[PDB]
Symmetry: C2
Subunit: 558 residues, 2 copies
């Protein structure tokens, strides 16, 4: 029957819930939680160089491994508003992170105090729960509920706001009998799976769409089991990328976009049947255009067919966690296999492989200045199958062409729905914190890279190596300095004459100098044949010093 | 699979969730739902004479039987804002009701227009979920989610807002494979029950407090088993009243006030240990007072101790549904009994019975004008153990007083925490709709009776008999000197000279004429010895005409 501060009890709860890592910016209002972290022990703290960096580190830490929940800590007032963008990026992708903010003492709550904010109302639209805890005895139970809410239903983030006086009040709490709350998920029934199987087996050219919910539910193995058991080819979404390996025979391409003109990935338009699991349907240009068809039936299996239904009504829908569903689809599909009821898909699957091997654009460009396509081709050569990519690039290409490849679930780590500029660097650091020794490769243009550039120092302080591929299209951009159209274009672009450069230039920021001052290593590449050797030198430097290594590739565009 | 309208699919989901009754006020924007009720059938509609009455009817219908969920239906605009008080009264007592409103078409939805309101924002504070459905294909799934949310966790109300064009739209839906979502509840562990059992057995003068969550979880039988097995006396709260029968040897009083200042329940002040199950401890105004003392240990078992634990923190808490917890407590108490380790409480139980026996007011009033205490004494003689009482009266006594008795769970139907004036009449009508043939007795003063007086016509139209005990303290009239300080007091009281009366009077409203116009039966009582015969004639009139019968008792005050 120990007595302890509410914040010490909060730390016991987090540890009992499996937290051993947190990212944060300390401050006075949240100091009792840090003292409790020191007293209880067992949580490694990684200090961020911006509160938004801590929230994106938490996001990347969650995404790196099923069951992880990144924790993000900040002080009263502006720290909490600094978290809103990271909570939004996470909730938009159904990613849980736990944010904790300090707060002004309770009597000072309803006045506009020195660094006191109504973080509850601001963060409510971007969290599953956001609460200021006004009763000290309730703090452990708010944290316990937080973990239930983050894991249950559609996963998503939570914010807990802690008044300074609440944190230090002594309370009773008993870690030895604490237990986590049960997790809630909707579950598919056998009758629902049997009906979907009847529509699947009735079809001539079935396809499986594998979205982020398959990965979110840790169901990629069952998704591939089901695809192989039925012989049905799979088309991942961007958030589903890597739920089946790109070189798997049943992996027959990616949904390059949704309803954008005549862009077609060939395998979709051939199909008479599409079963989506855990997938969104990206927006239609405000109305039915392409994938929707009277001749193509659609089945949708999702944790919330309570929100995603933008095909204007699937032919059949199942409300289910993707793993619980897929466990049943595999069990039923075996029963149809043993009975000889499954149709043979060998011919249609081989046709899907043919269109995939033909939809190939050449990208071995020798051009100087370097073309972006050459960079991705060299990245595929340089890094192994186990590389984990981190980026917010939603525009890999307009429609069709060489890009990257993904072979394992959660090796494509991308804030697809929100994806702010600056997400990538702190997110890649969170991935490195979750997977020590793993090979992590971020990809950004210079604007994205600059937003949160200072977070590179976090990887130098805590030895969190990863490789940053930095594609810079502002480096060549000519400062024409004739006032016709240049003076107006100058105001909406990144190039300027850097006066610290040896020679006349329009480079803008010297990223190599910035990265070096932040404690990291950097290389610059001007010719396409130097890209791959620079990537290899980056891996060696990374292994040697265990700090981030930036490879800046000089691009043609601006 | 045939297509159906979204609102037709909503009726199929409601029937499949067990709805066969709805209360409502028809209108243009909600009319397609009414057409869907007709075509699908199986749902009996009771028309209310005010939208607020429909919501209190649904409330009473929910409270009458475990598993019921009253449905309240209204049209666009002001009909939605009329539901807020009934939504509030239900959520405050953890009662689910489902409110359904029609809404303006999506084409002019976000813009304000005729009979259109942002009911989503207004109702969010008084619901677990409030949602305008903008996609017709999602309508069945929003209702499926609403039943999950209403039953899960801490139970509570949900509002669903349906634009007119959304209700009309054809969608695909399959009733044959529909299944309800799993219900989420927190669950006590054995180790937590063993530690609580340890604190209980360590004490010498234990008490159980049985609150509304015992009844809401359908756990009164388990609560009685546990008290009988351990020998521990029980003190129900007002919301817990009837979870143990009032004549049970272990029922040793109710909580007389959250803080009866010093006075209090004598058994509570004597106790050294209190275990609350499903109860709320209040703070009458954050009062530092006698409920808690350093020697009295408190254990709290509740579905929601993520917001409750007001005795400045219980010595130990368990987050659990009351039924799941009590099932475990009984099994652990059996093991402790079999091991010979359970303390004998019979001497402690007996002196709690002596104190209960002695702290009664043995007052039988002959007074004319009638005393309210005499009315309660006669209700106790008129009605048997199976009577169901419905009221918001709350303050039966300032500490302990002559009042009613309850013997069965859900035979005390009371909106305690937030009972508005006018709740009682529509709530009793909903109780009557839930339990045809049952004897239902409401109790109200004249102010409360007047708010929703027109709802009595609902009981005449659909033959929903119940007896209304109406205690009228405005009938006698005037105070003080004539036309002096009475002129100010006149403005804040209910008496006036009714000019339609044969004689000089200050009667105010003639409730008998009003009740007669509304199609119901009424009787008036002036002398105490006529109260019981009036109740018995009311029972006969109710059985003969099967419409509400009002017994108006003329009291002393004004």
């Amino acid at each position: 029957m120990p007595r302890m501060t509410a914040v010490e009890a909060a730390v016991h709860v987090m540890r009992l819930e499996g937290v051993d890592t947190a990212f944060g910016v300390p401050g006075a209002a949240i100091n009792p939680l840090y003292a409790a972290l020191r007293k209880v022990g067992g949580v490694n703290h990684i200090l961020a160089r911006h509160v938004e960096g801590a929230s994106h580190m938490a996001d990347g830490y969650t995404r790196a491994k099923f069951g992880n929940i990144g924790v993000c800590i900040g002080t009263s007032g502006p720290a909490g508003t600094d978290m809103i963008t990271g909570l939004y990026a996470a909730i938009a992708d159904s990613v849980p992170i736990l944010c904790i903010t300090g707060q002004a003492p309770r009597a000072r709550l309803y006045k506009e105090d020195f660094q006191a904010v109504d973080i509850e109302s601001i963060a409510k639209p971007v969290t599953k729960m956001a609460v200021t805890v006004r009763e000290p005895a309730l703090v452990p139970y708010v944290f316990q509920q937080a973990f239930h809410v983050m894991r249950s239903g559609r996963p998503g983030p939570v914010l807990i706001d802690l008044p300074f006086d609440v944190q230090m009040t002594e309370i009773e709490f008993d870690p030895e009998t604490y237990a986590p709350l049960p997790i809630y998920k909707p579950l598919a029934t056998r009758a629902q799976v049997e009906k979907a199987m009847t529509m699947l087996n009735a079809s001539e050219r079935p396809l499986l769409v594998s979205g982020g919910g398959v990965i979110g539910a840790d169901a990629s193995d069952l998704l591939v089991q089901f695809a192989e058991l039925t012989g049905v080819p799979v088309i991942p979404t961007l958030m589903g990328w890597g739920s089946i390996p790109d070189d798997h025979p049943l992996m027959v391409g990616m949904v390059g976009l949704q309803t954008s003109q005549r862009y077609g990935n060939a395998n979709l338009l051939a199909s008479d049947f599409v079963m989506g699991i855990g997938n969104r349907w990206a927006n239609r240009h405000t109305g039915g255009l392409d994938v929707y068809t009277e001749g193509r039936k659609f089945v949708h299996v999702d944790i919330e067919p309570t929100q995603i239904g933008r095909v204007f009504g699937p032919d059949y829908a199942i409300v289910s966690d993707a793993k619980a569903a897929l466990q049943l689809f595999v069990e039923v599909a075996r029963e149809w296999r043993a009975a000889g009821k499954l149709k043979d898909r060998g011919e249609w699957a081989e046709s899907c492989r043919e269109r995939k091997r033909t939809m190939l654009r050449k990208t071995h460009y020798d051009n100087v200045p370097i073309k972006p396509q050459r960079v991705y081709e060299e990245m595929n050569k340089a890094f192994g199958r186990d590389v984990t990519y981190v980026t917010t690039i939603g525009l890999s290409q307009i429609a069709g062409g060489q890009f990257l490849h993904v072979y394992k679930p959660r090796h494509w780590i991308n804030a697809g729905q929100a994806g702010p500029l600056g997400w990538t660097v702190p997110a890649a650091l969170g991935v490195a914190a979750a997977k020590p020794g793993a090979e992590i490769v971020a990809l950004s243009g210079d604007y994205d890279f600059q937003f949160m550039i200072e977070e590179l120092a976090v990887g130098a302080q805590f030895n969190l190596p990863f490789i940053q591929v930095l594609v810079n299209n502002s480096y060549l951009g000519l400062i024409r300095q004739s006032q016709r159209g240049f003076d107006m274009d100058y105001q909406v672009q990144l190039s300027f004459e850097n006066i610290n450069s040896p020679e006349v230039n329009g480079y803008g920021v010297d990223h190599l100098k910035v990265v070096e001052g932040l404690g990291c290593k950097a290389l610059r590449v001007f010719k396409p044949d130097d890209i791959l050797p620079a990537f290899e030198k980056a891996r060696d430097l990374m292994q040697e010093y265990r700090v981030p290594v930036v490879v800046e590739v000089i691009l043609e565009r601006v």
